[PDB]
Amino acid sequence: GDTKEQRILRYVQQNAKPGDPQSVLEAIDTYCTQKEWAMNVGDAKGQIMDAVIREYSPSLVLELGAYCGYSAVRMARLLQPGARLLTMEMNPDYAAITQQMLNFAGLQDKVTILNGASQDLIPQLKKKYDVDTLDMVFLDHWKDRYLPDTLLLEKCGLLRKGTVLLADNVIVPGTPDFLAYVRGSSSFECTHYSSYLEYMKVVDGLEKAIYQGP
Ligand SMILES: O=C(NCCO)c1cc(-c2ccc(F)cc2)cc(O)c1O
Numbered sequence: 001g002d003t004k005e006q007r008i009l010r011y012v013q014q015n016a017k018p019g020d021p022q023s024v025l026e027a028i029d030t031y032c033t034q035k036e037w038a039m040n041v042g043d044a045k046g047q048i049m050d051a052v053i054r055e056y057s058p059s060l061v062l063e064l065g066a067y068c069g070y071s072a073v074r075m076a077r078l079l080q081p082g083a084r085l086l087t088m089e090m091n092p093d094y095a096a097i098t099q100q101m102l103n104f105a106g107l108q109d110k111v112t113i114l115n116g117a118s119q120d121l122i123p124q125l126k127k128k129y130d131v132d133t134l135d136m137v138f139l140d141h142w143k144d145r146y147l148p149d150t151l152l153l154e155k156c157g158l159l160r161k162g163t164v165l166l167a168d169n170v171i172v173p174g175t176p177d178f179l180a181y182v183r184g185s186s187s188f189e190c191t192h193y194s195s196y197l198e199y200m201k202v203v204d205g206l207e208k209a210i211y212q213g214p
Pocket residue numbers: 039040041065066067140141142143168169172173197198
């Protein structure tokens with residue numbers, strides 16, 4: 001039968017307005033509160049994301065892990081005209097949901113999906129995707145990948161002074177190595193934003209880690 005992700009897409013298509021990102025976010029959050037939990041960033045942490053995006057107005061954002069496109073919708077709706085989001089989604093079924101979610105929201109021209117594993121695609125960003133450096137990175141993929149992929153971004157020359165890392169789920173499921181690393185490194189200036197796990201009365205949080213150079 002259908003998957004939960006297909007059910008979320010369908011709900012959005014039937015309960016949101018085409019081309020209205022806000023209605024799409026609302027539809028997802030309604031579905032996930034009333035029908036079935038799902039691992040979208042959600043509205044609590046989403047509001048914090050929004051506040052960070054507005055502060056920095058990034059021109060080029062990289063997202064690690066798309067899921068159904070909630071966070072990509074959340075971020076892309078607030079980008080300035082001409083700004084871009086690249087999202088890396090290794091799961092092909094998730095990638096297809098995400099594309100369709102973005103298309104329904106009318107944000108397709110702002111966002112590119114890269115299908116494959118972050119560790120494989122990050123080294124291609126400069127030469128294949130014509131990236132210089134990133135303004136912001138949203139980490140929301142497998143939690144054991146946050147640290148290695150941060151170190152890989154640095155190796156590949158993709159971080160500049162002031163690049164904003166924003167990491168989901170630093171408390172649940174948790175990213176203990178990543179947190180220890182960035183909080184102990186003089187190359188990062190970190191802030192913790194305490195919140196709640198999407199759609200649940202369980203504490204979670206976002207970590208912002210601003211790259212300071214070598
Ligand atoms: O696995 C995650 N992400 C990568 C695949 O898309 C993920 C997991 C959870 C979560 C799961 C199970 C639980 F019991 C609590 C949290 C939450 C999230 O926000 C997530 O991003």
